[PDB]
Coordinates of C-alpha atoms in Angstrom, one line a residue:
Chain A
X1 CA 0.0 0.0 0.0
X2 CA 2.0 3.0 1.3
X3 CA 5.4 2.8 3.0
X4 CA 6.9 5.9 4.5
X5 CA 10.5 4.7 4.7
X6 CA 13.0 2.2 6.1
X7 CA 16.2 2.9 8.0
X8 CA 18.5 -0.1 8.6
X9 CA 21.5 0.8 10.6
Chain B
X1 CA 2.3 1.2 -4.1
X2 CA 4.3 4.2 -2.8
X3 CA 7.7 4.1 -1.1
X4 CA 9.2 7.2 0.4
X5 CA 12.8 6.1 0.6
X6 CA 15.3 3.6 2.0
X7 CA 18.5 4.4 4.0
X8 CA 20.8 1.4 4.6
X9 CA 23.8 2.4 6.6
Chain C
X1 CA 28.6 15.2 15.5
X2 CA 24.9 14.6 15.6
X3 CA 23.7 11.7 13.3
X4 CA 20.3 12.0 11.7
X5 CA 18.5 9.4 9.5
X6 CA 15.0 9.5 7.9
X7 CA 13.9 6.8 5.5
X8 CA 11.3 8.6 3.4
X9 CA 8.2 10.8 3.5
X10 CA 5.0 10.1 1.4
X11 CA 2.7 13.0 0.9
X12 CA -0.5 11.8 -0.8
Chain D
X1 CA 30.7 16.9 11.5
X2 CA 26.9 16.2 11.5
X3 CA 25.8 13.3 9.3
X4 CA 22.4 13.5 7.6
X5 CA 20.7 10.9 5.4
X6 CA 17.2 10.9 3.9
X7 CA 16.1 8.2 1.4
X8 CA 13.4 10.0 -0.7
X9 CA 10.3 12.1 -0.7
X10 CA 7.2 11.4 -2.7
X11 CA 4.8 14.3 -3.3
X12 CA 1.7 13.0 -5.0
Chain E
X1 CA 36.1 -19.2 8.3
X2 CA 34.5 -16.7 5.9
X3 CA 33.8 -13.2 7.0
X4 CA 30.7 -11.8 5.3
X5 CA 28.9 -8.5 6.1
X6 CA 25.6 -7.4 4.8
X7 CA 24.4 -3.9 5.5
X8 CA 20.8 -4.6 4.9
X9 CA 18.2 -5.8 2.4
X10 CA 14.8 -4.2 1.6
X11 CA 12.6 -6.2 -0.8
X12 CA 9.8 -4.5 -2.7
Chain F
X1 CA 33.6 -21.0 12.1
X2 CA 32.0 -18.4 9.7
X3 CA 31.3 -14.9 10.9
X4 CA 28.2 -13.5 9.2
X5 CA 26.5 -10.2 10.0
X6 CA 23.1 -9.0 8.7
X7 CA 22.1 -5.4 9.5
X8 CA 18.4 -6.1 8.9
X9 CA 15.8 -7.2 6.4
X10 CA 12.4 -5.6 5.6
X11 CA 10.2 -7.6 3.2
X12 CA 7.4 -5.8 1.4
Chain G
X1 CA 13.7 -19.5 2.1
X2 CA 16.5 -19.1 4.6
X3 CA 18.1 -16.0 5.9
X4 CA 20.3 -14.9 8.8
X5 CA 23.8 -13.9 9.9
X6 CA 25.2 -17.3 8.9
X7 CA 23.2 -19.9 6.9
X8 CA 24.9 -23.3 6.3
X9 CA 23.1 -25.3 3.6
Chain H
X1 CA 16.3 -18.1 -1.8
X2 CA 19.1 -17.7 0.7
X3 CA 20.6 -14.5 2.0
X4 CA 22.8 -13.4 4.9
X5 CA 26.2 -12.4 6.0
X6 CA 27.7 -15.7 5.0
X7 CA 25.8 -18.3 3.0
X8 CA 27.5 -21.7 2.5
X9 CA 25.8 -23.8 -0.2
Chain I
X1 CA 17.0 16.2 13.2
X2 CA 19.4 15.8 16.1
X3 CA 20.7 19.1 17.5
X4 CA 24.1 18.9 19.3
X5 CA 25.8 21.9 20.9
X6 CA 29.3 21.6 22.5
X7 CA 31.0 24.7 24.0
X8 CA 34.6 23.6 23.9
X9 CA 37.2 21.1 25.1
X10 CA 40.5 21.9 26.7
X11 CA 43.1 19.1 26.5
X12 CA 45.9 20.2 28.7
Chain J
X1 CA 19.1 17.7 9.1
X2 CA 21.4 17.4 12.0
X3 CA 22.7 20.6 13.4
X4 CA 26.1 20.6 15.3
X5 CA 27.7 23.6 16.8
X6 CA 31.2 23.4 18.4
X7 CA 32.9 26.4 19.9
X8 CA 36.5 25.4 19.8
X9 CA 39.1 22.9 21.0
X10 CA 42.4 23.8 22.7
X11 CA 45.0 21.0 22.5
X12 CA 47.8 22.2 24.7
Chain K
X1 CA 44.2 30.9 31.2
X2 CA 42.6 28.4 28.8
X3 CA 39.1 28.4 27.3
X4 CA 37.8 25.8 24.9
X5 CA 35.0 27.5 23.1
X6 CA 31.8 29.6 23.4
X7 CA 28.6 29.0 21.5
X8 CA 26.0 31.8 21.4
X9 CA 22.8 30.4 20.0
Chain L
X1 CA 45.9 32.9 27.1
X2 CA 44.4 30.3 24.7
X3 CA 40.9 30.3 23.2
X4 CA 39.7 27.6 20.8
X5 CA 36.8 29.3 19.1
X6 CA 33.6 31.4 19.3
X7 CA 30.4 30.7 17.4
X8 CA 27.8 33.5 17.3
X9 CA 24.6 32.0 15.8
Chain M
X1 CA -8.0 17.9 -0.5
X2 CA -6.0 20.9 0.7
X3 CA -2.6 20.8 2.3
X4 CA -0.8 24.0 3.5
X5 CA 2.8 22.8 3.5
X6 CA 5.3 20.4 4.9
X7 CA 8.7 21.1 6.5
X8 CA 11.1 18.2 6.6
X9 CA 14.3 18.8 8.7
Chain N
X1 CA 19.1 32.6 17.2
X2 CA 15.3 32.1 17.5
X3 CA 14.1 29.2 15.4
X4 CA 10.6 29.2 14.1
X5 CA 8.9 26.4 12.1
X6 CA 5.4 26.6 10.5
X7 CA 4.1 23.7 8.4
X8 CA 1.4 25.4 6.4
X9 CA -1.7 27.6 6.5
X10 CA -4.9 26.8 4.6
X11 CA -7.4 29.7 4.1
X12 CA -10.5 28.1 2.6
Chain O
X1 CA -6.0 19.0 -4.7
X2 CA -4.0 22.0 -3.6
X3 CA -0.6 22.0 -1.9
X4 CA 1.1 25.2 -0.8
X5 CA 4.8 24.1 -0.7
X6 CA 7.3 21.7 0.7
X7 CA 10.7 22.5 2.3
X8 CA 13.2 19.6 2.5
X9 CA 16.3 20.2 4.6
Chain P
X1 CA 20.9 34.2 13.0
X2 CA 17.1 33.6 13.3
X3 CA 16.0 30.6 11.2
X4 CA 12.4 30.6 9.9
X5 CA 10.8 27.8 7.9
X6 CA 7.3 27.9 6.3
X7 CA 6.1 25.0 4.2
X8 CA 3.4 26.7 2.2
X9 CA 0.2 28.8 2.3
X10 CA -3.0 28.0 0.3
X11 CA -5.5 30.8 -0.2
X12 CA -8.6 29.1 -1.7
Chain Q
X1 CA 7.3 33.9 15.7
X2 CA 10.0 33.3 18.3
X3 CA 11.5 36.6 19.6
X4 CA 15.0 36.5 21.1
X5 CA 17.0 39.4 22.6
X6 CA 20.5 39.2 24.0
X7 CA 22.3 42.3 25.2
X8 CA 25.9 41.3 24.9
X9 CA 28.6 38.8 25.9
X10 CA 32.0 39.7 27.3
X11 CA 34.6 36.9 27.0
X12 CA 37.6 38.1 28.9
Chain R
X1 CA 9.1 35.3 11.4
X2 CA 11.8 34.7 14.0
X3 CA 13.2 38.0 15.3
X4 CA 16.7 38.0 16.9
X5 CA 18.7 40.9 18.4
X6 CA 22.2 40.8 19.8
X7 CA 23.9 43.9 21.0
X8 CA 27.5 43.0 20.7
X9 CA 30.2 40.6 21.7
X10 CA 33.7 41.5 23.1
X11 CA 36.2 38.7 22.9
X12 CA 39.2 40.0 24.8
Chain S
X1 CA 35.4 49.2 31.1
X2 CA 34.0 46.3 29.1
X3 CA 30.4 46.4 27.8
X4 CA 29.2 43.6 25.6
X5 CA 26.3 45.3 23.9
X6 CA 23.1 47.2 24.3
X7 CA 19.7 46.6 22.6
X8 CA 17.2 49.4 22.6
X9 CA 13.7 48.5 21.1
Chain T
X1 CA 36.9 51.0 26.9
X2 CA 35.6 48.1 24.9
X3 CA 32.0 48.2 23.6
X4 CA 30.8 45.3 21.4
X5 CA 27.9 47.0 19.7
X6 CA 24.6 48.9 20.0
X7 CA 21.3 48.1 18.4
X8 CA 18.7 50.9 18.3
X9 CA 15.3 50.0 16.8
Chain U
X1 CA -17.8 34.5 3.0
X2 CA -16.1 37.7 4.2
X3 CA -12.6 37.6 5.7
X4 CA -10.8 40.8 6.6
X5 CA -7.2 39.7 6.5
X6 CA -4.6 37.2 7.7
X7 CA -1.2 38.0 9.1
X8 CA 1.4 35.2 9.2
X9 CA 4.7 36.0 10.9
Chain V
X1 CA -16.0 35.4 -1.3
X2 CA -14.4 38.7 -0.2
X3 CA -10.8 38.6 1.3
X4 CA -9.1 41.9 2.2
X5 CA -5.5 40.8 2.1
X6 CA -2.9 38.4 3.4
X7 CA 0.6 39.2 4.8
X8 CA 3.2 36.5 4.9
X9 CA 6.5 37.3 6.6
Chain W
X1 CA 9.9 49.9 19.1
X2 CA 6.2 49.5 19.3
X3 CA 4.9 46.4 17.5
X4 CA 1.3 46.3 16.2
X5 CA -0.6 43.6 14.4
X6 CA -4.1 43.6 13.2
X7 CA -5.6 40.7 11.2
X8 CA -8.4 42.5 9.4
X9 CA -11.5 44.5 9.5
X10 CA -14.8 43.7 7.7
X11 CA -17.2 46.7 7.5
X12 CA -20.4 45.2 6.1
Chain X
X1 CA 11.5 51.3 14.8
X2 CA 7.7 50.9 14.9
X3 CA 6.5 47.8 13.1
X4 CA 2.9 47.6 11.9
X5 CA 1.1 44.8 10.1
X6 CA -2.5 44.8 8.8
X7 CA -3.9 41.9 6.9
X8 CA -6.7 43.6 5.0
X9 CA -9.9 45.6 5.1
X10 CA -13.1 44.7 3.3
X11 CA -15.5 47.7 3.0
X12 CA -18.7 46.1 1.7
Chain Y
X1 CA -1.8 51.1 17.8
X2 CA 0.8 50.6 20.5
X3 CA 2.5 53.9 21.6
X4 CA 6.0 53.8 22.9
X5 CA 8.0 56.8 24.2
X6 CA 11.6 56.8 25.4
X7 CA 13.4 60.0 26.3
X8 CA 17.0 59.0 25.9
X9 CA 19.7 56.5 26.8
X10 CA 23.2 57.5 28.0
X11 CA 26.0 54.9 27.8
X12 CA 29.0 56.3 29.6
Chain Z
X1 CA -0.3 52.4 13.4
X2 CA 2.3 51.9 16.1
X3 CA 3.9 55.2 17.2
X4 CA 7.5 55.2 18.5
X5 CA 9.4 58.2 19.8
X6 CA 13.0 58.2 21.0
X7 CA 14.7 61.5 22.0
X8 CA 18.4 60.6 21.5
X9 CA 21.1 58.1 22.5
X10 CA 24.6 59.1 23.7
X11 CA 27.4 56.6 23.5
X12 CA 30.4 58.1 25.3
Chain a
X1 CA 27.0 66.9 31.5
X2 CA 25.4 64.2 29.4
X3 CA 21.8 64.1 28.3
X4 CA 20.3 61.3 26.3
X5 CA 17.3 63.0 24.7
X6 CA 14.0 64.8 25.2
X7 CA 10.6 64.1 23.7
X8 CA 8.2 67.0 23.9
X9 CA 4.7 65.9 22.9
Chain b
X1 CA 28.3 68.6 27.2
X2 CA 26.7 65.9 25.1
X3 CA 23.1 65.7 24.0
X4 CA 21.6 62.9 21.9
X5 CA 18.6 64.5 20.3
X6 CA 15.3 66.3 20.8
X7 CA 11.9 65.5 19.3
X8 CA 9.5 68.4 19.4
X9 CA 6.0 67.3 18.4
Chain c
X1 CA -28.2 51.3 7.1
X2 CA -26.1 54.3 7.9
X3 CA -22.5 54.5 9.2
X4 CA -20.6 57.7 9.8
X5 CA -17.0 56.6 9.7
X6 CA -14.4 54.1 10.7
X7 CA -10.9 55.0 11.9
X8 CA -8.3 52.1 11.9
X9 CA -5.3 53.3 13.9
Chain d
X1 CA -26.7 52.1 2.6
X2 CA -24.6 55.2 3.4
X3 CA -21.0 55.4 4.7
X4 CA -19.1 58.7 5.3
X5 CA -15.5 57.6 5.2
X6 CA -12.9 55.1 6.3
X7 CA -9.4 56.1 7.4
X8 CA -6.8 53.3 7.5
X9 CA -3.7 54.5 9.5
Chain e
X1 CA 0.5 67.8 20.6
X2 CA -3.2 67.1 21.1
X3 CA -4.5 63.9 19.6
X4 CA -8.1 63.6 18.6
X5 CA -9.9 60.7 16.9
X6 CA -13.5 60.7 15.9
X7 CA -15.1 57.7 14.1
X8 CA -18.0 59.5 12.4
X9 CA -21.2 61.4 12.8
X10 CA -24.6 60.5 11.3
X11 CA -27.0 63.5 10.9
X12 CA -30.3 61.9 9.9
Chain f
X1 CA 1.8 69.1 16.1
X2 CA -1.9 68.3 16.6
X3 CA -3.1 65.1 15.1
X4 CA -6.8 64.8 14.1
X5 CA -8.5 61.8 12.4
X6 CA -12.1 61.7 11.4
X7 CA -13.7 58.8 9.6
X8 CA -16.5 60.5 7.9
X9 CA -19.8 62.4 8.3
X10 CA -23.1 61.4 6.7
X11 CA -25.6 64.3 6.4
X12 CA -28.9 62.7 5.3
Chain g
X1 CA -11.2 68.5 19.9
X2 CA -8.6 68.2 22.5
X3 CA -6.9 71.5 23.4
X4 CA -3.2 71.4 24.5
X5 CA -0.9 74.3 25.5
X6 CA 2.7 74.3 26.7
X7 CA 4.6 77.5 27.4
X8 CA 8.2 76.6 26.8
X9 CA 11.0 74.2 27.6
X10 CA 14.5 75.1 28.6
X11 CA 17.2 72.4 28.3
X12 CA 20.4 73.7 29.8
Chain h
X1 CA -9.9 69.6 15.3
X2 CA -7.3 69.4 18.0
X3 CA -5.7 72.7 18.9
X4 CA -2.0 72.7 19.9
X5 CA 0.2 75.6 21.0
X6 CA 3.8 75.7 22.2
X7 CA 5.7 78.9 22.8
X8 CA 9.3 78.1 22.3
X9 CA 12.1 75.6 23.1
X10 CA 15.6 76.7 24.2
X11 CA 18.3 74.0 23.8
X12 CA 21.5 75.4 25.4
Chain i
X1 CA 17.2 83.3 36.1
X2 CA 15.5 80.4 34.2
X3 CA 11.8 80.5 33.2
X4 CA 10.3 77.4 31.5
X5 CA 7.2 79.1 30.0
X6 CA 4.0 80.9 30.6
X7 CA 0.5 80.1 29.5
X8 CA -2.3 82.7 29.9
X9 CA -5.6 81.4 28.7
Chain j
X1 CA 18.2 84.9 31.6
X2 CA 16.5 82.0 29.7
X3 CA 12.8 82.0 28.7
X4 CA 11.4 78.9 27.0
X5 CA 8.3 80.5 25.5
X6 CA 5.0 82.3 26.1
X7 CA 1.5 81.4 24.9
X8 CA -1.2 84.0 25.3
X9 CA -4.6 82.7 24.1
Chain k
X1 CA -38.3 68.6 11.0
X2 CA -35.9 71.4 11.6
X3 CA -32.3 71.3 12.8
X4 CA -30.4 74.5 13.3
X5 CA -26.8 73.5 12.9
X6 CA -24.1 71.0 13.9
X7 CA -20.5 71.9 14.8
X8 CA -17.9 69.1 14.6
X9 CA -14.5 70.2 16.1
Chain l
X1 CA -37.0 69.3 6.4
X2 CA -34.6 72.2 6.9
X3 CA -31.0 72.1 8.2
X4 CA -29.1 75.4 8.6
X5 CA -25.5 74.4 8.3
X6 CA -22.8 72.0 9.3
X7 CA -19.2 72.9 10.2
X8 CA -16.6 70.1 10.1
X9 CA -13.3 71.3 11.5
Chain m
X1 CA -10.0 86.5 22.2
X2 CA -13.2 84.6 23.3
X3 CA -13.7 81.1 21.9
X4 CA -17.4 80.7 21.1
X5 CA -19.3 77.8 19.6
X6 CA -23.0 78.0 18.7
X7 CA -24.5 74.8 17.3
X8 CA -27.5 76.4 15.7
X9 CA -30.7 78.3 16.2
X10 CA -34.2 77.4 15.0
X11 CA -36.7 80.2 14.7
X12 CA -40.1 78.9 13.7
Chain n
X1 CA -9.0 87.6 17.6
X2 CA -12.1 85.8 18.7
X3 CA -12.6 82.2 17.3
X4 CA -16.3 81.8 16.5
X5 CA -18.1 78.8 15.0
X6 CA -21.8 78.9 14.1
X7 CA -23.3 75.7 12.7
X8 CA -26.3 77.2 11.0
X9 CA -29.6 79.1 11.5
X10 CA -33.1 78.1 10.3
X11 CA -35.6 81.0 10.0
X12 CA -39.0 79.6 9.0
Chain o
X1 CA -31.4 90.6 22.2
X2 CA -28.1 88.9 21.7
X3 CA -27.3 85.2 21.1
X4 CA -24.1 83.3 20.9
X5 CA -21.6 80.9 22.6
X6 CA -19.9 84.0 24.1
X7 CA -22.1 87.1 24.4
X8 CA -20.1 90.2 25.6
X9 CA -22.2 93.4 25.7
Chain p
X1 CA -30.4 91.4 17.5
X2 CA -27.1 89.8 16.9
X3 CA -26.3 86.1 16.4
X4 CA -23.0 84.2 16.3
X5 CA -20.5 81.9 17.9
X6 CA -18.8 85.0 19.4
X7 CA -21.1 88.1 19.7
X8 CA -19.2 91.2 20.9
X9 CA -21.3 94.4 21.0
Chain q
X1 CA -19.8 101.5 33.5
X2 CA -16.7 100.2 31.7
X3 CA -16.3 96.5 31.0
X4 CA -12.6 95.5 31.2
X5 CA -11.1 92.0 31.0
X6 CA -7.5 91.1 31.7
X7 CA -6.6 87.5 31.0
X8 CA -3.5 87.5 33.2
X9 CA -0.2 89.2 33.9
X10 CA 3.2 87.6 34.7
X11 CA 6.1 89.8 35.7
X12 CA 9.5 88.3 35.9
Chain r
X1 CA -19.0 102.6 28.8
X2 CA -15.9 101.3 27.0
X3 CA -15.5 97.6 26.3
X4 CA -11.8 96.7 26.5
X5 CA -10.2 93.2 26.4
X6 CA -6.6 92.3 27.0
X7 CA -5.6 88.7 26.4
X8 CA -2.6 88.8 28.6
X9 CA 0.7 90.5 29.3
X10 CA 4.1 89.0 30.1
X11 CA 7.0 91.3 31.1
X12 CA 10.5 89.8 31.3
Chain s
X1 CA 1.9 101.2 39.1
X2 CA -1.8 100.2 38.7
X3 CA -3.3 97.3 36.8
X4 CA -6.5 95.4 36.6
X5 CA -9.6 94.7 34.7
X6 CA -10.8 98.3 34.9
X7 CA -8.5 101.1 36.1
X8 CA -10.1 104.5 36.5
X9 CA -7.7 107.3 37.6
Chain t
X1 CA 2.6 102.6 34.4
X2 CA -1.0 101.6 34.0
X3 CA -2.5 98.6 32.1
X4 CA -5.7 96.6 31.9
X5 CA -8.8 96.0 30.0
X6 CA -10.1 99.5 30.1
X7 CA -7.8 102.4 31.4
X8 CA -9.4 105.8 31.7
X9 CA -7.1 108.6 32.8
Chain u
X1 CA 27.6 -2.4 10.9
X2 CA 28.9 -1.9 14.4
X3 CA 29.6 1.5 15.7
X4 CA 32.8 1.4 17.7
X5 CA 34.5 4.3 19.5
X6 CA 37.9 3.9 21.1
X7 CA 39.4 6.9 22.9
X8 CA 43.0 5.8 23.0
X9 CA 45.5 3.3 24.3
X10 CA 48.8 4.0 26.2
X11 CA 51.3 1.1 26.0
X12 CA 54.4 1.7 28.1
Chain v
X1 CA 29.9 -0.7 6.9
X2 CA 31.2 -0.3 10.5
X3 CA 31.8 3.2 11.8
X4 CA 35.0 3.1 13.8
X5 CA 36.7 6.0 15.5
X6 CA 40.1 5.7 17.2
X7 CA 41.5 8.7 19.0
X8 CA 45.2 7.7 19.1
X9 CA 47.7 5.3 20.4
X10 CA 51.0 6.0 22.3
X11 CA 53.5 3.1 22.1
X12 CA 56.5 3.8 24.2
Chain w
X1 CA 46.9 -8.3 18.1
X2 CA 44.5 -5.8 16.7
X3 CA 43.4 -2.3 17.7
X4 CA 40.7 0.1 16.6
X5 CA 37.2 1.5 17.2
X6 CA 35.7 -1.5 15.4
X7 CA 37.8 -4.7 15.3
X8 CA 36.2 -7.5 13.4
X9 CA 38.3 -10.6 13.0
Chain x
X1 CA 44.5 -10.2 21.9
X2 CA 42.1 -7.7 20.5
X3 CA 41.1 -4.2 21.6
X4 CA 38.4 -1.8 20.5
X5 CA 35.0 -0.3 21.1
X6 CA 33.4 -3.2 19.3
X7 CA 35.4 -6.5 19.2
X8 CA 33.8 -9.3 17.2
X9 CA 35.9 -12.4 16.9
Chain y
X1 CA 52.6 12.5 30.9
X2 CA 51.0 10.3 28.3
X3 CA 47.5 10.5 26.7
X4 CA 46.4 8.0 24.2
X5 CA 43.6 9.7 22.3
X6 CA 40.4 11.8 22.5
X7 CA 37.3 11.4 20.4
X8 CA 34.9 14.3 20.2
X9 CA 31.6 13.1 18.7
Chain z
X1 CA 54.6 14.6 27.0
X2 CA 53.1 12.4 24.3
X3 CA 49.6 12.5 22.8
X4 CA 48.5 9.9 20.3
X5 CA 45.7 11.6 18.4
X6 CA 42.5 13.6 18.5
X7 CA 39.4 13.2 16.4
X8 CA 36.9 16.1 16.2
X9 CA 33.7 14.8 14.7

């Protein structure tokens, strides 16, 4: 649907 | 659908 | 220094 | 110094 | 043994 | 033995 | 399938 | 399939 | 984002 | 983004 | 004597 | 004596 | 509809 | 100095 | 619809 | 100095 | 918006 | 918007 | 005599 | 005599 | 619909 | 629809 | 000095 | 000095 | 509007 | 609007 | 001596 | 001596 | 109906 | 109807 | 000097 | 000097 | 309207 | 309207 | 000596 | 000596 | 009816 | 009816 | 001199 | 001299 | 007779 | 007779 | 008899 | 009799 | 000498 | 000498 | 990956 | 990858 | 051996 | 041996 | 004496 | 004496 964002550190 | 962005560090 | 991370923004 | 990261912005 | 490093994976 | 590192996985 | 730090098949 | 830091087939 | 303020450091 | 302010550093 | 720094915000 | 720096924001 | 604005920092 | 943030204004 | 503006920093 | 951010204004 | 007043700073 | 006033700084 | 500054408003 | 500055408004 | 004015500061 | 004015500063 | 703000006047 | 802001006047 | 009166300022 | 009166400023 | 100012209204 | 100013209204 | 005047100061 | 004047100062 | 403000007069 | 403001006069 | 009278001012 | 009178000012 | 002023109405 | 002013109405 | 005069001052 | 005069000053 | 104000006179 | 203000006179 | 705001006879 | 704002006879 | 008016007298 | 008016007299 | 409203010598 | 509104010598 | 910070080491 | 920070090392 | 902020062996 | 902020062996 | 290192972060 | 190193970050 809608995905804001992904942060993998 | 819609993906804002991805940050992989 | 300061470390900032933002994945993404969806404006719909 | 300061480290900033932003993936992307979608304006729809 | 082997030394393998993977930062990350995002699958769309 | 092997040394493997995975930062993360997000599956969409 | 399989995923992880170390995956021995 | 398979994924990870080290993948031994 | 993060906001960091440091005055100074004296290494004597 | 991140905002870092450092006055100064004296290494004596 | 010794002064590291001054920040005026 | 010694002064590192001054920031005027 | 109507959106004024967006500030991202 | 002073920091001011306004997102937006809608006058319908 | 109507969007005023977007600031990205 | 002073920092001011405004996203947008809509006058319908 | 924000209103800031500083008279002065003497670093002696 | 933001309004900032600083008189002066003396670094002596 | 050391005076930093004066603001008159 | 050291005067940083004067603001008149 | 009567609006005098708007001040944004 | 009557609007006098808008000031943005 | 003096600071004055008036939004608006509707004389109907 | 003096600062004055008026949005608008509607004389209907 | 606002009315502000200041006679004078002496910085000796 | 706003009315501001200042006689004078002396910086000796 | 020293006089700042005079407002006569 | 020293006089800043005079406003006569 | 009737209105003499308006002063906006 | 009737309006004498408006002064915007 | 003297300050006089009068809105208006309606002579019907 | 003197300051006089009059909106208006309606002589009906 | 308002009536104002001032004789004189001596600044010495 | 408003009536204002001032005789004189001596700045010495 | 010193006379500020005189008002005779 | 010094006379500011005179107002005779 | 009758109105003699009006003085606005 | 009748109105003599009006003085606006 | 004298300061006289007469509004009006109605003689029917 | 005298300051006289007469609005008006109605003689029917 | 005499009629006025100020009547000096 | 006499009629006015100031009537001096 | 006579009609005399004196507003005032100041003797310095 | 006579009608005399004197507004005022100042003697310095 | 003599002064006043009415002075009759 | 003599002064006033009416002075009759 | 890992975030490692080492100040220093003195080997004497 | 890893983020490593080493200040310094003194070997004597 | 090994030395560092991050030491992966 | 090994030394560091992060030591993975 | 001896100082190994300093990290400002 | 001796100083190894400094990191300003």
